[PDB]
């Protein structure tokens, strides 16, 4: 389940030559590095404690590569403008996600490489790291252009090599941080809703990693389609929050139970109002 990813974003700035470029790296969904074109002094920066292990040459090297990406995204955005017959007067976006996943056996599980224009799928490298999948006609142009040039082999090499190399290293250096858990602190609240009905909220707070499952049950059945589940949100200190509520008849609250499943919980919790 381990993984590493770099989410890159280039936003064109009408009238200007250089687009804004932002690169964020992640290991097991935790931001660990970031480069922002706007900074007073553009440079990849540490975003996780365990990254303080890297010497000055590391940041120097990563920063140079970023400069290279800036140019690539700059030219690509210009090309895309042409593909879609768009005007340069407006702002446009080109995004890229790339990285690798490790299975339970530790070998490489899969490599990834996908691009999006204006926030929509554009083109993606298939799992075989040899063929491309284009989302539309414009992308078809890119696809045919890249097959003829053999870009796939370039990406495949990085994805099966350097990507795996550094992921193992990072997982090794930040082991104590990345492999930790903070089981959720949960509780149920009771709120007025409408006549003869009340709301019961099951809260899960300060947990890590973000993965979690909250369920409600009524007489042995999970209330799948009658439960409001909010989207997981960051507490701001590295941990997350989430809750699921149900509307129940006033007087029958005791018939409902909430279960919390998290990897920091050897046994699922079971609460009720």
């Amino acid at each position: 389940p381990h993984s590493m990813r770099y989410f890159e974003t280039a936003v064109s700035r009408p009238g200007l030559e250089e687009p804004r470029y932002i690169s964020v790296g992640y290991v097991d969904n935790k931001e660990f590095v970031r480069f922002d074109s706007d900074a007073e002094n553009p440079r990849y920066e540490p975003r996780a404690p365990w990254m303080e292990q890297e010497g000055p040459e590391y940041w120097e090297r990563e920063t140079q590569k970023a400069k290279g990406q800036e140019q690539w995204f700059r030219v690509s955005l210009r090309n895309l403008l042409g593909y879609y017959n768009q005007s340069a007067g407006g702002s446009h976006t080109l995004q890229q996600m790339s990285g690798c996943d490790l299975g339970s056996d530790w070998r490489l599980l899969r490599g990834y490489l996908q691009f999006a224009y204006e926030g929509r799928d554009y083109i993606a490298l298939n799992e075989d790291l040899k063929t491309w999948t284009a989302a539309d006609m414009a992308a078809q142009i890119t696809r045919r252009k890249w097959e003829q040039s053999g870009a796939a082999e370039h990406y495949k090499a990085y994805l099966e090599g350097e990507c795996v190399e550094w992921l193992h290293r990072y997982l090794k250096n930040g082991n104590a941080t990345l492999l930790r858990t903070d089981s959720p602190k949960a509780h149920v609240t009771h709120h007025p809703r409408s006549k003869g009905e009340v709301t019961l909220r099951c809260w899960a707070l300060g947990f890590y990693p973000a993965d979690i499952t909250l369920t409600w049950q009524l007489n042995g059945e999970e209330l799948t389609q009658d439960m409001e589940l909010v989207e997981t949100r960051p507490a701001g200190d590295g941990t997350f929050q989430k809750w699921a509520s149900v509307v129940v008849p006033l007087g029958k609250e005791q018939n409902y139970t909430c279960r919390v499943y998290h990897e920091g919980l050897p046994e699922p919790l079971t609460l009720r109002w």
Binding site: S23, V33, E62, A66, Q69, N79, Y83, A151, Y155
Partner: peptide
């Protein structure tokens, strides 16, 4: 370690 895109642009 970040990737450096292939010489071919979109």
């Amino acid at each position: 370690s970040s990737l450096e895109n292939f010489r071919a642009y979109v």
